[PDB]
Write a protein that binds this ligand. Structure first.
Ligand SMILES: [Mg+2]
Ligand SMILES: [Mg+2]
Ligand SMILES: [Mg+2]
Ligand SMILES: [Mg+2]
Lengths: 203, 549, 486, 23, 139, 137, 132, 129
């Protein structure tokens, strides 16, 4: 989007021309709630941009192989003109990831992370019964930060007796780091904010 | 100058050196393998990184002919003189000998050809295009160009056969800054107290010419220091000192952030009484990623960056932000709540993009969002709006704080006394992950804050602040500040009236306990009970969301 | 004009003098220490501070070659001739001698090169960028620049090598104002009863270009007085009167009471006439306000000796028609700090984000010409409780009140700006703005008592003829619940 | 001989306004 | 006049102002009078188009810069003073802003008497009474 | 015409108005009819384009000023007279305002518009003047 | 070359184009290749000049004036086909266009083979959008 | 045609065409693609004003009419659609005409001996011109 007149739609034309030139391509529109707003005043330039997107999306066929990926947090404010059949039919819901999913996320985030061999991640999954992937990233990050703190204090002590080998006593993420890190985990979606998504899925 | 003068870049220097030397030093290998290398190179990156310096180095070390073309020197008044100038330049370059063409500030001659509206410039760019490639286009002459805005060039000019390779002379790292410092200190005589490695570790956003500016400032301070006392005795034994370098560092800032320099404020961790655990938490949040990178990548996890302060007003959120700004090595970018909005369409998002680009360019950087609820509020609540400009702004913030970015060190600090008004999409981990509640001080905290405010004030010897801390129960930091201010004001009144009485024909060197006693009558609790209940309910709801643990 | 005629900024003066003179006076030092001096300066600040004056002083004093470049002086019709003019200027400067290049009002030929769309500005900016710092950049020439807004300059020009350091020539202080007054009253014929320290004290927000205006106004008043007393003298003025003109204190006081700082010329309030004796009752509030507004300004030394910053805010609340606006008028009349008055819903605008821009502008005007008293009449409009309205007008009220919040106390430079509030419904003000540090003390103005009512009646009847036998005590007893309005 | 000349006049911008809803 | 100084090509408004001031100061002590200064002195930071900024800066440099003026007086006339660049409302450029506002009863009486000096009236017409009924009539 | 003289070029519409006034005053005492001034008189406060304010100022200077008009009158036309500069509705520029908004006038217009054609002998204009009760003219 | 048709003397560009085209026609059934037509096709709206008017009109007149016996054809190469002056596109001057599109995987393999047939060698499935 | 009027000479071209059509005979002017000349108005303003004052200035002794073709029916000035210039529009909304166009085009070639153009007119549905 730009202040000047025409430049905005010209930018949509340029991006889609570049996308079509290097066919096949995958144009990822993240946070569609800024372009595909409800039509429903501000000059109506938003309507002009939406019309440019619709007219520039209708020139898609089997040829040119242009696959458009949408991604929105609030799907209710997406204009239905994009959701109608023959324009973008398939829509898919990503839910909060069951216990096996929780174990999979935990194992996938700790792939390149040394950990205690005698450590089980099923307990963490069974404990977190309403968390999201971002929460798992935060919990593992807090554990890593506490491990870093232990390493730095141990190195400081090491230098302390050196003034008067192994870099740190334990490079691995000890169990106690997790066991103490659990006191700062917050579940970041409320069940009320999930009820609307459930209703939309039923819709 | 020479290749030894250029520093902070190794891969880019190697690429330029090979592409300029092998074509004109070992051409038999090129016909032996069969294929000629790229024939044009485009240097791009932020300003003041070494582009023109690199061109000068190439012109110096290479024995081949060199021809320089500044940006707008090509075009003149007479019709067709610009294209005539380019033709003459290329013909003279090719005729005499193998030569290097360097066009300085190419972005002043090659617009995009679709947004331009003039006539002569279009013909000039078409002349350049047809002159670079085609039948009898170029024969054994390499072309160099420098720019600061690579996106401002027509793509037709940036294809193979015209400018095949693009080299990115970007911001140096700590080692690059150390190399540049060593290069720029090679001629001046320097004292023994210097520690260049720590100094380079402190220049957290400097790039190229900024280091030279720092050196020049540190030098100038000594000349202005060893001149008040006045011969050959002073011309020698200069010895630039480490304190001069520290002073020069304390003043100068990276050229990128010169637009948004924050006005100087002076506070310290001793000034922020109480909140010791939160202080240490912020220290370990902000300093560990920057001070211990190697061990951080040893575990192979990214840092945790975001943070939000929420609590009753007048408790010290902005004070903590000031402390972080003044007593942390990283760069600081102060942003107000609504300062970024604009009347025009799409300019608010442009300003947000510019701010975050400036922040991540000179990383590590801290961005302080003051009253974040001003510009990051719930989406879709507003029925009557200005075209949903606010919704677009919050979406821009959502994408910019966590999205298709490089994950550079950029910390965002949000301060708002209203946390329920923030959209949940910002409170998610990954953008603002840890929410710090800043509650009302307790008795020990009240004593600590009272001492912190009175660290500079002279008091009676028998005066004790324990009674004042004990008496106040529901007070906040601003209320104790008000008590101190009232006491000081009454002391000033006593001083001035005593001075008048004495002048009728240091009477108050201290602030008496009586002044505090009779200045506490008007004391009040700024935060009512309703807001205390609301914030406690918010905290209890946050805790209640977690369960089975 | 020499270097002894620019007073108020000694630090900036010496800072410029360093690189303009020392590398030419004593070149041995820089070759001894091994590094070259800076050769680029950008003078910025509010208009009327001494930038062009300092450039004139540098031109007159230094023996080096000087070349003046006006901002829009370079433009020509043919494509590629403005840059030709720049080439001619710089080549002459380099070919002749070690010269100084002064570019006056550089903001008009140096935009960001990214928001502009004209072709000639982009090309001239690129030309300047290459001329200052390119291949074989510069040979012992120093470039000086002046602007009123530095943020509207190309970032590529605000770099070492092009503009090494930016000097901030800002608003002077009491010592600087005294220096300017001494400088501007050294060639005129003063009277024997004139003192300048008090005159420099009572002048508060004057940027130094207003001091010359004050002197000229005093001279014009003197000539007007001596031409009213003497005949117009159409043919030829008598020589005897010229031998004695002088300038008394009354002329300076009159001119001071008329003139205002150039920064506050837009927001000049109409001269209303209220005095402390016009407001009856509220004696304790009157003295409290007088001290709260006078102590921080005249006696800063004691405050800094006590190591505490003065109290700023104050709020008035009470039933309507009790004297809040009257107290505001009384403060505005005979207090020495500058006054900025705004009605309740006066800073609102149709455009999006413009109200916050207006708040920023008015608070910047207040902070520039400090000390300043900002009166917000009917606070309930502009600082209503935020979040209460289930509906909204786009959430503009929340944004404006947030701007007020973080403009009275946030990430800003502490300075002497006092905020007086006046309201008749305090319950619907957000608590976030009523805390100490923004609005410190909340004063209540009750309905007057018997003695207060008598004093109010006397205050209203200062210039009214009455019967000798009229007694107002019965009137005071008869009301028993009235306000000043009744 | 002929000669050229440059000219740059103006452009067109877009503003945004705020409205008030009476429910 | 205000809008009459700028022309089609880029760089003539400033050239026109330069020629005007040079002619004014070339020969004798001169008076300059700019009608509708608000039309060629817009408040910067709120206006678009580079020509406006450039002409404003040229005016500022002409009226007060190095070797500013030599015995030349400038007069302006506007209806909206607040819509002028604050750099123009400074001492040395526009130092005395006189307020020519609506007259009072005596001034309106004077205006009526001056305007009716050449028009032939009747002996029964009294100007003193007629001026009093008018309240807001200006000039 | 209103829209005709307004342009996007800088310093051209003002030149157009100056040329028009010079042409009108050059030949003989004439009548200038400038139609739809409301399109080129946006009150100087609600507008944002600088060309509109510049042409407004040019119009004000042309109508009033040193040797402004010498035996030549100007006529305007608009639908909403409120959206005009107060400076333009002054004496010396638009000192007179005329309201040009009935049955008898409608009948007169019917008579004068059918003067050059022999319609019939039994056509009564009273019904036309009574039935076409909402016709502008 | 498009931008090489102007000249220094007043109107000498017209003579240059005229002599060039007449020499191309009179000699033999030749082939003429015109570079960067976009440089001489700004849609007639963004010109605001007089040299462009004369040279473009001369080119129109000379292109129209082509006898059948000339047996000379012109080949144009434009990278911006939608920014073309429609006056040049009318039938009788330029009627048949050719959409030079993106090659397929087989085309990419063919070009790879063509380019690698002159080097000492010791891909067309991952290379998708590459062109020419 | 529409965009063939530009090069102050568009007004001279409009006056030249109107005086040429008025001078010779009572005749007809064809203005094809009026959407380029008339940009719906909300040098184009000058040429639209010239076409307005030239279409209005036709008296009884001119006796010329004008015909104008357009593609879209919405981007036209209502001042051009006002009473006096353009009021009588037609709405041209087949197989016989398609057979006529076929017999017009392909009759100038050594065609065949076994062709039935009725089938070519029938199986072709949406082609035009
Ligand atoms: Mg460079
Ligand atoms: Mg704060
Ligand atoms: Mg100046
Ligand atoms: Mg009041």
């Amino acid at each position: 989007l730009s202040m000047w007149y025409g430049e905005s739609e010209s930018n949509i034309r340029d991006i889609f021309d570049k996308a079509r030139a290097a066919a096949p391509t995958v144009v990822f529109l993240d946070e569609l709630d800024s372009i595909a707003k409800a039509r429903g005043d501000a000059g109506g330039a938003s309507d002009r941009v939406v019309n440019q997107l619709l007219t520039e999306m209708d020139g898609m066929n089997a040829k040119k192989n242009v696959f458009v990926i949408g991604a929105t947090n609030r799907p209710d404010q997406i204009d239905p003109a994009i959701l109608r059949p023959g324009r973008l039919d398939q829509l898919i819901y990503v839910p909060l990831p069951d216990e096996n999913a929780r174990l999979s996320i935990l194992n996938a985030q700790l792939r390149k992370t040394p950990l205690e061999p005698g450590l089980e991640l099923t307990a963490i999954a069974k404990a977190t019964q309403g968390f999201s992937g971002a929460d798992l990233l935060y919990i593992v990050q807090r554990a890593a930060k506490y491990a870093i703190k232990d390493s730095i204090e141990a190195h400081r002590q090491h230098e302390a007796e050196k003034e008067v080998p192994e870099v740190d006593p334990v490079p691995y993420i000890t169990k106690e780091h997790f066991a103490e890190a659990m006191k700062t985990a917050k579940r970041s979606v409320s069940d009320a904010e999930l009820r609307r998504y459930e209703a939309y899925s039923q819709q | 100058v020479g290749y030894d003068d250029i520093g902070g870049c190794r891969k880019q220097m190697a690429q330029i050196r090979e592409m300029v030397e092998l074509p004109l030093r070992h051409p038999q290998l090129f016909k032996a393998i069969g294929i000629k290398p790229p024939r044009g190179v485009l240097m791009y990156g932020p300003p003041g990184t070494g582009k023109t310096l690199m061109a000068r180095a190439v012109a110096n070390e290479t024995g081949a002919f060199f021809f320089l073309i500044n940006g707008p020197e090509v075009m003149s008044k007479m019709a067709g003189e610009s294209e005539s100038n380019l033709r003459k330049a290329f013909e003279e370059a090719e005729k005499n000998a193998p030569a290097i063409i360097f066009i300085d500030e190419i972005d002043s001659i090659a617009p995009k050809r679709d947004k331009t509206n003039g006539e002569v410039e279009r013909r000039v760019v078409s002349q350049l295009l047809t002159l670079m490639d085609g039948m009898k286009a170029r024969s054994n002459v390499v072309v160099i160009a420098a720019t600061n805005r690579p996106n401002s060039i027509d793509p037709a000019l940036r294809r193979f056969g015209r400018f095949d390779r693009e080299v990115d002379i970007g911001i140096p790292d700590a080692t690059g800054r150390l190399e540049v410092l060593r290069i720029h200190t090679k001629n001046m005589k320097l004292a023994d107290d210097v520690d260049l490695e720590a100094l380079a570790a402190e220049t957290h956003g400097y790039v190229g010419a900024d280091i030279a500016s720092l050196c020049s400032e540190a030098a100038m301070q000594q000349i202005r220091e060893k001149m008040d006392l006045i011969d050959a005795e002073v011309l020698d034994s200069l010895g630039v000192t480490m304190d001069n370098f520290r002073f020069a560092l304390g003043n100068s800032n990276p050229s990128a952030l010169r637009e948004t320099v924050v006005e100087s404020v002076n506070v310290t961790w001793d000034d922020v009484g109480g909140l010791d655990e939160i202080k240490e938490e912020l220290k370990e949040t902000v300093e560990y990623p920057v001070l211990h990178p190697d061990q951080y990548t040893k575990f192979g996890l990214s840092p945790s960056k975001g943070v939000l302060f929420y609590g009753p007003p007048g408790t010290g959120k902005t004070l903590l932000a000031k402390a972080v700004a003044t007593e942390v090595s990283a760069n600081f970018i102060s942003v107000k709540g609504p300062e970024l909005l604009s009347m025009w369409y799409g300019e608010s998002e442009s300003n947000i993009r510019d701010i975050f680009d400036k922040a991540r360019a000179a990383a590590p950087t801290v961005v302080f969002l003051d009253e974040l609820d001003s510009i990051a509020k719930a989406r879709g609540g507003s029925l009557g709006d200005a075209g949903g400009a606010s919704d677009r702004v919050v979406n821009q913030l959502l994408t910019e704080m966590d999205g298709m970015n490089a994950k550079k060190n950029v910390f965002v600090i949000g301060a708002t006394n209203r946390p329920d008004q923030i959209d949940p999409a910002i409170l998610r981990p990954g953008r603002l992950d840890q929410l710090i509640y800043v509650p009302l001080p307790d008795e020990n905290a009240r004593l600590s804050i009272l001492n912190a405010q009175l660290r500079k004030t002279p008091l009676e010897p028998g005066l004790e602040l324990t009674a004042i801390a004990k008496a106040t129960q529901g007070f906040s930091g601003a209320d104790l500040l008000y008590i101190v201010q009232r006491a000081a004001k009454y002391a000033i009144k006593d001083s001035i009236e005593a001075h008048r009485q004495h002048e009728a024909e240091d009477p108050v060197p201290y602030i008496t306990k009586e002044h505090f006693a009779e200045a506490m009558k008007t004391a009040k609790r700024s935060v009512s009970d309703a807001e205390l209940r609301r914030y406690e309910a918010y905290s209890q709801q946050m805790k209640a969301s977690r369960g089975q643990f | 004009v020499g270097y002894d005629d620019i007073g108020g900024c000694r630090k900036q003066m010496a800072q410029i003098r360093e690189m303009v003179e020392l590398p030419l006076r004593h070149p041995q030092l820089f070759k001894a220490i091994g590094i070259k001096p800076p050769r680029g300066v950008l003078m910025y600040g509010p208009p009327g501070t001494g930038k062009t004056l300092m450039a004139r002083a540098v031109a007159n004093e230094t023996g080096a070659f000087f070349f003046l470049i006006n901002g829009p002086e370079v433009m020509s019709k043919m494509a590629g001739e403005s840059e030709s003019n720049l080439r001619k200027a710089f080549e002459e400067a380099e070919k002749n001698a070690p010269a100084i290049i002064f570019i006056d009002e550089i903001d008009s030929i140096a935009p960001k090169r990214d928001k502009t769309n004209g072709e000639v500005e982009r090309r001239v900016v690129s030309q300047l960028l290459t001329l200052m710092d390119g291949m074989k950049a510069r040979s012992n020439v120093v470039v000086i620049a002046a602007t009123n807004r530095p943020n509207s300059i190309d970032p590529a020009l605000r770099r070492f090598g092009r503009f090494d350091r930016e000097v901030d020539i800002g608003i002077p202080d009491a010592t600087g104002r005294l220096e300017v007054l001494r400088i501007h009253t050294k060639n005129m014929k003063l009277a024997d009863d004139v003192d300048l320290e008090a005159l420099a004290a009572e002048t508060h927000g004057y940027v130094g270009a207003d001091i010359a205006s004050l002197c000229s106004e005093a001279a014009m008043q003197q000539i007007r007085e001596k031409m009213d007393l003497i005949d117009l003298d159409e043919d030829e003025i008598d020589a005897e009167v010229l031998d004695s003109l002088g300038v008394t204190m009354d002329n300076f006081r009159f001119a001071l009471g008329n003139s205002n700082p150039s920064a506050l010329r837009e927001t000049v309030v109409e001269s209303v006439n209220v005095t402390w004796d016009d407001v009856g009752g509220l004696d304790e509030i009157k003295e409290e306000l007088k001290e709260t507004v006078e102590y921080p300004v005249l006696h800063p030394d004691q405050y800094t000796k006590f190591g505490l910053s003065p109290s700023k805010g104050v709020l008035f609340y009470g039933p309507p028609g009790t004297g809040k606006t009257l107290l505001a008028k009384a403060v505005a009349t005979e207090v020495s700090a500058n006054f900025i008055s705004v009605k309740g819903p006066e800073l609102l605008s149709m455009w999006y984000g413009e109200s916050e821009s207006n708040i920023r502008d008015i608070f910047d005007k207040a902070r520039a010409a400090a000390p300043t008293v900002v009166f917000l009449d009917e606070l309930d409009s502009i600082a209503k409780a935020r979040g209460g309205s289930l509906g909204d007008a786009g959430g503009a009220s929340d944004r404006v009140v947030n701007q007020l919040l973080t403009e009275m106390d946030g990430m800003n430079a502490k300075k002497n700006v006092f905020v007086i509030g006046a309201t008749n419904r305090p319950d619907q003000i957000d608590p976030a703005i009523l805390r100490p540090g923004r609005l410190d003390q909340l004063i209540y103005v009750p309905l007057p008592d018997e003695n207060a009512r008598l004093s109010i009646l006397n205050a209203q009847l200062r210039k009214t003829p009455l019967e000798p036998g009229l007694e107002l005590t019965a009137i005071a007893k008869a009301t028993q619940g009235f306000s000043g309005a009744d | 001989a002929a000669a050229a000349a440059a000219a740059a006049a103006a452009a067109a911008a877009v503003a945004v306004a705020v409205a008030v809803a009476a429910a």
